Write a protein that binds this ligand. Structure first.
Ligand SMILES: [Cl-]
Ligand SMILES: [Cl-]
Ligand SMILES: [Cl-]
Ligand SMILES: [Cl-]
Ligand SMILES: [Cl-]
Ligand SMILES: [Cl-]
Ligand SMILES: [Cl-]
Ligand SMILES: [Cl-]
Ligand SMILES: [Cl-]
Ligand SMILES: [Cl-]
Ligand SMILES: [Cl-]
Ligand SMILES: [Cl-]
Ligand SMILES: [Pt+2]
Ligand SMILES: [Pt+2]
Ligand SMILES: [Pt+2]
Ligand SMILES: [Pt+2]
Ligand SMILES: [Pt+2]
Ligand SMILES: [Pt+2]
Ligand SMILES: [Pt+2]
Ligand SMILES: [Pt+2]
Ligand SMILES: [Pt+2]
Ligand SMILES: [Pt+2]
Ligand SMILES: [Pt+2]
Ligand SMILES: [Pt+2]
Ligand SMILES: [Pt+2]
Ligand SMILES: [Pt+2]
Ligand SMILES: [Pt+2]
Ligand SMILES: [Pt+2]
Ligand SMILES: [Pt+2]
Ligand SMILES: [Pt+2]
Ligand SMILES: [Pt+2]
Ligand SMILES: [Pt+2]
Lengths: 172, 172, 172, 172
């Protein structure tokens, strides 16, 4: 219906709105992860900073999707944001595992939207995702994987010491 | 139960968590307001920028409350974020009226928490709100009031022209 | 037949030549639009400057397509350039409507060439269009849409005043 | 009796003098803690520096209280300073626990004086404490809590190694 809208399906428009919800949900999860690591009885500030930065990045991702939605003449529709899956996130290992699962879920949503765009013959959409989201997700998942490996190596024996050292020497 | 917690009631802890929810809800409302004014069929970029900046400020407010919650040995608890009250926000006048109602609701929540802190004899809480929230809200509400007055003066006659001029000469 | 040519169909080569013609035609239309707004009896210099800049951008687009045609070992073939569709372009509203129709026609030609490249399995072509044309067109069409909305809002009542203000406060 | 004194009760004046004694006692405790960690058979210089800085901060606190006492037309009265509670402070964990207990005792004295000021309707006093003492104490107690958590995590196994690493990588 927009004067500008061209080659932009209702199916893609709706999936973009869903993806915005997913990115904002992810941002909210990272906010909870960050503040958990800032608790006085957890106290791993490099971990808190890692997750707070991710909270920012996912919010930024949502805003880029909303910008794009408006550029194509789609209509942003916001839904309720579901609270994060946990109130307490365990150890740095637990938290990093939860983060990689979240990232893989966002990546899968990106890949699903890419496939939809390809089926709807919407190359602007495909370029947009390739240019601003797909590579960023692959890089982030690789970093997280690297972190998991390092954390697991450290907490095999002397879990406390290992968690401290990872925060001090990798994250901080 | 925290090793650090001192003079910090369960009632205040819970009300802080509720206030975080309110600020994040407000931020989400301002995100929707901003992107509405960025629609091709609305196209008032100074208005979009005004509301996007407010979205940032309310998120920052929530983060300051969460920082404080952890400093006092309280435990952050996140809930679902309710979607904004509207999908479409009407004219700049409608939007500014919706914003002032939202701000007044946040202000009332601040005043209610202040009164609770006073009843619980929690001066750190009272100082915190006075120092970082109460004055900021009064300033913002005054600015919004000033904007409403200017918008109403402009759209009495020639509503379209007036909306354009307010965006160009006040907001931009 | 070129020593360099690889995976570059005759169908794509020909469509590239047609697209060059379309971009040069568009540039010529924008030259006519610009000089119309520079007439002493029209005299909207911000509008003239807007369209003259677009004339440059479309010429640049044509030159990028010709560069690419030579990089792939295709052969540039020039045709006659049809004169613009009008000698006089009416108001700023009329002109902006004519511009968005032109841009949408260029966008459709880009999307058609993209689909051809996809059918001919020519990813260099698809990347080229994605990287240098598709996003630029979406951005431009969005800007034009925003302008139309602003012009329409202004000329509902007091058409003359509104046209002056849009030129002074948006375009200039 | 002072020419300047206004709305400044004898009860507050006396409690201010007691608080000065408490801050100077605290400073003296931190001096003993610092020099203990500088012993050749303890030798944790980051710990020594942490506590020596706190000794300075508490002396500064006392001096601010004495300044204020004179600004309100009260009369400073000094008492004997009791020696610190220990001659030897054990491990970094023991020492940090002793420090947080001391800080909580100072915080409680601040809160008690705040309540007295509120009962005596002395807002200059309440502002003074809020502005210069209450927030500083909450921040310090949170930091100490964070340190305790980190030290405990480190000395669960390999107590010696953990104490070294905390001094090197957090305190130094
Ligand atoms: Cl559709
Ligand atoms: Cl930090
Ligand atoms: Cl849920
Ligand atoms: Cl309680
Ligand atoms: Cl903008
Ligand atoms: Cl709702
Ligand atoms: Cl061929
Ligand atoms: Cl000029
Ligand atoms: Cl013709
Ligand atoms: Cl008295
Ligand atoms: Cl030293
Ligand atoms: Cl003694
Ligand atoms: Pt940080
Ligand atoms: Pt960082
Ligand atoms: Pt694709
Ligand atoms: Pt881009
Ligand atoms: Pt990007
Ligand atoms: Pt902006
Ligand atoms: Pt701004
Ligand atoms: Pt108060
Ligand atoms: Pt503050
Ligand atoms: Pt502040
Ligand atoms: Pt110009
Ligand atoms: Pt220009
Ligand atoms: Pt493609
Ligand atoms: Pt390129
Ligand atoms: Pt380019
Ligand atoms: Pt030192
Ligand atoms: Pt220092
Ligand atoms: Pt007070
Ligand atoms: Pt002061
Ligand atoms: Pt101060």
């Amino acid at each position: 219906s927009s004067q500008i809208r061209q080659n932009y399906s209702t199916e893609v428009e709706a999936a973009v709105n869903r993806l915005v919800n997913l990115y904002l949900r992810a941002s909210y999860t990272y906010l909870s992860l960050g503040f958990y690591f800032d608790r006085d009885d957890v106290a791993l500030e490099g971990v808190c900073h890692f997750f707070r930065e991710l909270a920012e990045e996912k919010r930024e991702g949502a805003e880029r999707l909303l910008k794009m939605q408006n550029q194509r003449g789609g209509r942003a529709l916001f839904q309720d944001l579901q609270k994060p899956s946990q109130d307490e996130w365990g150890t740095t290992l637990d938290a990093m595992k939860a983060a990689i699962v979240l990232e893989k879920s966002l990546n899968q949503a990106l890949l699903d939207l890419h496939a939809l765009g390809s089926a709807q013959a919407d190359p602007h959409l495909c370029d947009f995702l390739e240019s601003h989201f797909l590579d960023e997700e692959v890089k982030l998942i690789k970093k997280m994987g690297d972190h998991l490996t390092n954390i697991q190596r450290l907490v095999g024996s002397q879990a406390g010491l290992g968690e401290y050292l990872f925060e001090r020497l990798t994250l901080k």
